[PDB]
Structure formats: C-alpha cells, structure tokens
Design a protein around this motif. Structure first.
Motif: not given
Ligand SMILES: [Cl-]
Ligand SMILES: [Cl-]
Ligand SMILES: [Cl-]
Ligand SMILES: [Cl-]
Ligand code: NA
Ligand code: NA
Lengths: 99, 99
Positions: B19-22, B82-84
């Motif tokens: 689980l991540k923000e992207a 940033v996560n993309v």
């Molecule tokens: Cl994250």
C-alpha cells in the motif's frame, strides 16, 4: 476530446499566437515550451529543486487555445525535453482523469 | 473515478501487495517507485535519454490495484522524486484524459 494514453498524449496548441505541439502532462505543475517566440514581457523564474534547478522565462497572461478551449495562463520558456501542458493550463480547460 | 487537476493527482495504490501513494502521471511512460519491496524477480532495464541513461530494476507481471481495478503489469524500481503511475498502468485500467 477523449484522450487515450497508448502513446504520449500530444495535442496541437496555439500559445501566444504560436502554433505548437505539446504533451498533456498531469505530472507537471507548469506549462513550459522551448524554441518559441512569445509576445510581451518576461521575468526570470527559478523552477526545480536542489540537484535540478532551472532558470526559465515566465510570460504571464498568455492566450492559450486547445481544441477550441480559449484560456489565459502563465507560460514558461526554457529547457524541456518536450513542450508540456501542465496542470495549471489543464485546470483552465476543465480537463480530468477518468477510469 | 473522475479526478480534477487543481491538486497533484495522488492516489492510493496496492502494488505487489504494498500500500503506497503514487502520482497519476500522463507524462510518464513507466510506473516507477523508489522504496518498495516487490515480489518476484527483476531484470535490469535502461531508462532515460538525453539528460542521462541509467539502469533500473524491472519487475514484470506485478499485481496492481487502483480504485478496485486489478491488473498485472510492469513496475520499475529506481530513482524518482515521487512514486509514479505511468501510461503503461493507466492504459490497463482504461484511463483517459477528457475535456
Ligand atoms: Cl507512499
Ligand atoms: Cl512544436
Ligand atoms: Cl498539490
Ligand atoms: Cl547505470
Ligand atoms: Na506501505
Ligand atoms: Na515477475
């Protein structure tokens, strides 16, 4: 229009009376062109961050037209691998991501 | 969903069970994370171009879930600010830009 993402999403845009191709880039905050001759006065602007600063020209209150949507926005001029339409212009044309 | 662009379009994703923000990034060809513990094996992949080429890790057939859409796709692990989520993943979930 309804733009698919199978290829890079370039559109034709008229910016400051100049007809150009630029990429609709939801990852970019700002709209930036290289190799363009815009009207009016510019001021310098620093973008980026440590490890990647860029000093560019900022032109303000520039007419921009995309697919018949006419807006007025800020346009940066300086090094960029492709011309970019950022969120600032896409919000003015009412663009959204949908899935 | 339908996502406007007044803010950066971060979404919560589950990638390789993580689980991540992207950031939904139509200017990115590939989905890429720094800092993730993906399953399976990786192979080296060359990325970049004029500014510089670099080898990163490529994980293939990785489960990706965004807003309930489950697909399997390629995920790179290498330097990114940033996560993309790039166009490869967005095409698999049927995303379009609309205005
Ligand atoms: Cl994250
Ligand atoms: Cl052009
Ligand atoms: Cl934001
Ligand atoms: Cl390398
Ligand atoms: Na996590
Ligand atoms: Na794999």
């Amino acid at each position: 229009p309804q733009i698919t993402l199978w290829k890079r999403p370039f559109v034709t845009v008229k910016v400051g009376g100049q007809l150009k191709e630029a990429l609709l880039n939801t990852g970019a905050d700002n709209t930036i062109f290289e190799d363009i001759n815009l009207p009016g006065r510019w001021k310098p602007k620093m973008v980026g961050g440590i490890g990647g600063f860029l000093k560019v020209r900022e032109y303000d209150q520039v007419p921009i037209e995309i697919a018949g949507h006419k807006v007025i926005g800020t346009v940066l001029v300086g090094p960029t691998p492709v011309n970019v339409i950022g969120r600032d212009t896409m919000t003015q044309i009412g663009a959204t991501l949908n899935f």
